[PDB]
Amino acid sequence: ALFTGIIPPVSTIFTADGQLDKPGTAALIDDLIKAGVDGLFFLGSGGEFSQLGAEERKAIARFAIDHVDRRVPVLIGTGGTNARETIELSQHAQQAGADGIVVINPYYWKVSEANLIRYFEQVADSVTLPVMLYNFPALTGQDLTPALVKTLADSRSNIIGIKDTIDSVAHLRSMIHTVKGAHPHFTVLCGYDDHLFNTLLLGGDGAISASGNFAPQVSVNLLKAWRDGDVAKAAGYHQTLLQIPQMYQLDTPFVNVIKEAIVLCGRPVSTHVLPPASPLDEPRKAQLKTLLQQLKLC
Amino acid sequence: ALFTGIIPPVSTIFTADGQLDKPGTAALIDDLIKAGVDGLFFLGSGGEFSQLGAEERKAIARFAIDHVDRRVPVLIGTGGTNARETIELSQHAQQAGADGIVVINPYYWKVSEANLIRYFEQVADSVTLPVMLYNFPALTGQDLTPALVKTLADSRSNIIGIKDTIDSVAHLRSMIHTVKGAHPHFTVLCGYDDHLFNTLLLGGDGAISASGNFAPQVSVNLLKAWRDGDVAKAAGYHQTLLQIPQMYQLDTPFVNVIKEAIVLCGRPVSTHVLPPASPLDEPRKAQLKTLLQQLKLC
Amino acid sequence: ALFTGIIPPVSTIFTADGQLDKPGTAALIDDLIKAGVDGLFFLGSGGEFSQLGAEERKAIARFAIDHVDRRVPVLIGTGGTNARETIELSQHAQQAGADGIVVINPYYWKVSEANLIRYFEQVADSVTLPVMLYNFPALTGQDLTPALVKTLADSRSNIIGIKDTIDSVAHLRSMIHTVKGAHPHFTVLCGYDDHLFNTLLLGGDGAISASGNFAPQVSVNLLKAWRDGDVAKAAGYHQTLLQIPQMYQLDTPFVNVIKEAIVLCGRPVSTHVLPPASPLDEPRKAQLKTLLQQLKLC
Amino acid sequence: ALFTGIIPPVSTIFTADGQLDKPGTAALIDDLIKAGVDGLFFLGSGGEFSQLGAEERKAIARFAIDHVDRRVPVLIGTGGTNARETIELSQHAQQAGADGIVVINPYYWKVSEANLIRYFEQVADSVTLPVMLYNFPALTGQDLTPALVKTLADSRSNIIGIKDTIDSVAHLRSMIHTVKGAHPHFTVLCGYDDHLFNTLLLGGDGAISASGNFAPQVSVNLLKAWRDGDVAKAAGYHQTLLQIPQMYQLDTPFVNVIKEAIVLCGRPVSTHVLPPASPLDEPRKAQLKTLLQQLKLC
């Protein structure tokens, strides 16, 4: 099983001009590796992939991969609506030294099932890297069903995992039963902090969630306790993770909230976010600070 | 805080003629009280209230309350679309000796917010009993928001709880935060087996869920372990509760599955369900058995 | 084709104490027959079926059937969630002298397709009357697809039409293509005022819509002009029907608006509605008046 | 009022290698101008904007603008998820000689209302050109409400129109009332063939719809009859438009269908579409043919 455990969707740090901030991004990366995470996911939703151009995306992927320097496995989010660009980004990721790619379904047109299967087959066939699917139906408007994901895992042997970003115990349970039933080593990662514990108890593999960025120790220590067989200690961390997502209601998008949390929890970086996201105002930063303090996160 | 803990939505047991089966109903009630439940809820969704006439509802309430004979707190589900009837069913439940009523929002017309607040205020004023709200938006098509629930709890002091039937950590967390923040003794009970653990860890109060009928020991042992500070033990029971809901997929509606489970787990009753529900077939009964066996429930 | 043309969903008139107002209801019935409608539909959504008990429904049906006295075809809405009651209301409608019944799908539980087919088969077999289906997915949360409706028309020969209540050209077109393609005399009536014209141009058969109560001359004259080949005259009435539904925004439910409009347009009746509906306040009554006056309807 | 009447969302013609086909696109352009359209819209949804890179889009806009050579007004679709790119495409379109831009809301993140208002204000402030909004909630997952459109029309005087792409008489009626009530020359165009007639009768201004490509004469002729006060002639064209959208069911996306209809109605071009769209198979091409022949379109 590839890409198991805690694999944060790393924020991309930008300067005030909206250019990749190399020292800031590098420092966040080294904080996360230092914290014991199992891998790093660049250019996911929280990494602002959808607000970046293709060449910006390539430059960021290359920098991120080079800085990591094989210390942990690296995943690159290569999806979008332009399928030709997906292939271009996916092959670039492979050429630059990524260990895998993460591919969301096209989120403008909700393409027919036949087009959807064909889309994922051809992205898969375009690289010889492992491929992880990315389900985010709140944003895409099209759920990757456990049945369709099984079909894909049946069709292509490099389709080996999923980030299932959904607030649903049923979706996760059924994803694990349906797909891991047929494909024992298929990786099921939840996209939400507050589902890591259940995911593990259901027989899934970990999480790619936002709090990996500013509070990686909570998820890391939950996974460690769980693997140790210390279910009480695991559940104590889960109790914190249950409460964290209150801060994501502060703005939409909440990539600004995640970067301000990174700052408040001890890492000085530019908080700049790319439009149409916008800075978190002072009242909502104070609100964030008090929540992080209440959770003993800073 | 009223109605806390494990409060099963008791199945209504009927003979072949579609008439109340008093001995079957009595025996189920007596099984559940013996299992150590904290209360009994009659004529919830799983009790088939929506397939019953007003007079039959009154007959069932009467019989159930009298048999319970004050051994545990009793809730009666009195809602529907006919608000005159809701008031009639509520005052009947009070006169008959109920300890509280559970009231769903009208589920044909999704009435305006002003009509909805008025409805709930009107039914709460019709009785002097405690009133629990019932949120089940998958069936009602209209969610009872934490903000609207708070308004109701501010507005009437006998509106004291909610059964929040939803597969959503966010909805439960926000319910608890919003309403219990304002009303510390307001009772939050989840409607799904697989959210009990999370509900307790979030600061809520228990569950009214289907497995209460055929595996009450699992939720009962979970609540007891939790209240004893033995979180690992509680998590062990949660792991069973996480898996149980796959049986509910066998039919729609799944009131037939619940009764077949009661029989399989050791209580012989007739498993008759009211139209438009229909008998569970032999192949699906066979799948139910092996799931219950796999979970060590029979 | 049975039950074609203009068939108003007649409001039920009640006294201030919430009982059937016989003179008021009889006079509304007589206005509509005088206005040239093709049928009368009692106890539809606008007739407040979902707010009335079983015995009130029987009483209203009997009175309405008797007052009409075979001068136009009479339909009775017999649906609900209690399928045993649907059968008993449908059999009563037949014995009382109704010409057909209109049956909505169960709208609490969205039953499996197997259960849904079985339900409509059972109701259709309980009577030797014409059966019209009622699709209202905004309220039911479950669409009667053209495929499913064709399966029902294939299955029972007394399932002979549908009231399709949806703001969708595509749903109406596909309903007509699919069902009338296999059953040329299956009747398709739209449930909204502003789709009557399109329904006719698409090859369907008329409307059961709210404005049939207070402005029946608009629909009746549209249908007449269309059959006369005076398409420009039809389109002029259509322009009025396009603007009418802004008045329905005044309340939810808007059964109060419909009764107030009957009054405003010349027929003094009591405008009492059953909870959870409530009286229309004086400002919205005035707004309703100004909308009617703008459309030259009073 | 700017950009009224019939403004097709022009197909982008590509060669078998996926590059802009200049002579094919030029021929389509000249066919439409010659058919009497009131303007041309490049890089809408049907123009495959979402499957194209930013540089590809700039090349297409430049070529289409230069080929039209001021013969009719030209709109360019500039939107996407990357707001910085939206501004860059919008400024490029103005510098290239476009008459206006059409801007969809961001369709990955559904941004907060504040972020959404701010986005359209900054795109509008980036150009001195007329701006038309684009509502397509089936694809974006975020409806531009009549109330929000009116707030934008109040805020920026170059925000002067909307393409409202919705199967809804209610949405169109309310859009027209709310926004044109406040701004009499704000232009409301429907996005669907089968709502053109209702749009005009409601007080709106025309259509940007797929059949403008292959059957422009139907819409042009309808608009001409309407403006002539010959409503019966207009309604005869509408009867064809009511039936056209069956063909769009043949694939998702249906950009392939539109180009194959262009070919079947008499203009030989390459019918290549960009992934994740795919070629229409021979069976579905025949089906398209028979549908066009039935409507006397080829």
Which pair of tokens denotes residue A150? Answer: 């099984």
Give the Cα separation of B265 and B298 in Å (integer): 5
| Interface residues on A facing B, Cβ-Cβ cutoff 8 A | 167-170, 173-174, 177, 192, 194-195, 198, 201-202, 230-232, 234-236, 238-239, 242-243, 245-246
- Give chain A's end-to-end CA distance (angstroms, integer): 34
Residue D253 and residue A109: Cβ atoms within 8 Å?
yes
Give the Cα separation of C97 and A38 in Å (integer): 75
Chains that touch C (3 or more CB pairs under 8 A): B, D
- Chain C residues in contact with D234 (beta carbon < 8 A): 235
CB atoms inside a 10 Å sphere around CB A155 = 12
Answer positive or negative: Cα dihedral of A215, A217, A220, A225.
Answer: negative
Is C108 catalytic? The answer is yes
| Interface residues on C facing D, Cβ-Cβ cutoff 8 A | 167-170, 173, 177, 192, 194-195, 198, 201-202, 230-232, 234-236, 238-239, 242-243, 245-246
Minimal Cα–Cα distance from D168 to chain C, Å?
A: 6
- Report the residue of chain C nearest D176, measured CA to CA: C243
User: Amino acid identity of D242?
Assistant: L
Q: C-alpha distances in angstroms, B205 versus A241, B1, B38, B226?
A: 19, 9, 11, 11
Beta bridge partner(s), residue C40: C74
- Point out the catalytic residue in the list B134, B150, B219, B285: B134
Contacts of C191 (CB under 8 A, 6+ apart): C9, C135, C136, C163, C164, C165, C166, C207, C208, C209
Would you call the peptide bond into B73 cis, given omega within 30 degrees of 0 as the criterion?
no
- Residue B141: left if φ>0, alpha if ψ -120 to 50, beta else—which one? left
DSSP string, D143-200: ---HHHHHHHHHH-TTEEEEEE--S-HHHHHHHHHHHHHH-TT-EEEESSGGGHHHHH
Picking from B169, B177, B245, the nearest residue to A170 by CB comes out as: B245
Which pair of tokens denotes residue D64? Answer: 């289409």
Beta bridge partner(s), residue B202: none
Residue D234 and residue C235: Cβ atoms within 8 Å?
yes
Annotated active-site positions of D, please? 45, 108, 134, 163
Would you call the peptide bond into B23 cis, given omega within 30 degrees of 0 as the criterion?
no
- Residue A5: left if φ>0, alpha if ψ -120 to 50, beta else—which one? left
- Give chain B's end-to-end CA distance (angstroms, integer): 34
* Contact assessment for residue B41 and residue B72, using Cβ atoms and an 8 Å cutoff: no
CB atoms inside a 10 Å sphere around CB C229 = 9
Picking from B18, B45, B111, the nearest residue to C276 by CB comes out as: B111
- Compute CA B36 distance to the chain's CA centroid, rounded to the nearest angstrom: 16
| Interface residues on A facing D, Cβ-Cβ cutoff 8 A | 18, 45, 50-54, 81-85, 106-112, 114-116, 118-119, 122, 139, 141, 251-253, 274-278
- Point out the catalytic residue in the list A108, A155, A157, A278: A108
SS3 A261: helix
Residue A275 and residue D84: Cβ atoms within 8 Å?
yes
The conformation of residue C222, written as its DSSP 8-state character, comes to H
Among A165, A169, A252, which would you mutate to test the B interface (most chain B Cβ atoms within 10 Å of its Cβ)? A169
Residue B275 and residue C52: Cβ atoms within 8 Å?
no
* Contact assessment for residue A109 and residue D252, using Cβ atoms and an 8 Å cutoff: yes
- Report the residue of chain A nearest B232, measured CA to CA: A232
* Contact assessment for residue A257 and residue A279, using Cβ atoms and an 8 Å cutoff: no
Residue A81 and residue D141: Cβ atoms within 8 Å?
no
Minimal Cα–Cα distance from A239 to chain B, Å?
A: 6
Give the Cα separation of C85 and C79 in Å (integer): 8
The conformation of residue D69, written as its DSSP 8-state character, comes to T
Minimal Cα–Cα distance from B11 to chain A, Å?
A: 23
Find the CATH number of the domain harbouring D124. Answer: 3.20.20.70
- Point out the catalytic residue in the list A58, A150, A163, A259: A163
- Give chain D's end-to-end CA distance (angstroms, integer): 34
Range of the domain at D11: 1-298
Look at chain C and count its residues: 298
* Contact assessment for residue A140 and residue A105, using Cβ atoms and an 8 Å cutoff: yes
- Point out the catalytic residue in the list C11, C45, C126, C209: C45
Which pair of tokens denotes residue C164? Answer: 């399709």
* Contact assessment for residue C167 and residue C209, using Cβ atoms and an 8 Å cutoff: no
Residue B232 and residue A236: Cβ atoms within 8 Å?
no
Which helix (H) or strand (E) element contains residue D101?
strand D100-104
Query: How many structural domains are present in chain B?
Result: 1
Structure-solving method = X-ray
Give the Cα separation of A79 and B41 in Å (integer): 49
Answer positive or negative: Cα dihedral of B91, B92, B96, B101.
Answer: negative
CB atoms inside a 10 Å sphere around CB C294 = 10
Chains that touch D (3 or more CB pairs under 8 A): A, C
The shares of helix, strand and coil residues in chain C, as percent rounded to the nearest 5, are 50, 10, 35
Contacts of D226 (CB under 8 A, 6+ apart): D197, D200, D234
Is B192 catalytic? The answer is no
- Point out the catalytic residue in the list C58, C134, C211, C285: C134
Picking from B169, B201, B242, the nearest residue to A173 by CB comes out as: B242
- Give chain C's end-to-end CA distance (angstroms, integer): 34
Among D57, D88, D108, D118, which would you mutate to test the A interface (most chain A Cβ atoms within 10 Å of its Cβ)? D108
Give the Cα separation of A235 and A225 in Å (integer): 9
Helix axes A231-241, B231-243, angle to 10 degrees: 70
Minimal Cα–Cα distance from B18 to chain A, Å?
A: 33
- Chain A residues in contact with B195 (beta carbon < 8 A): 169
Q: Phi and psi for D13 in degrees, rounded to 5?
A: -90, 130
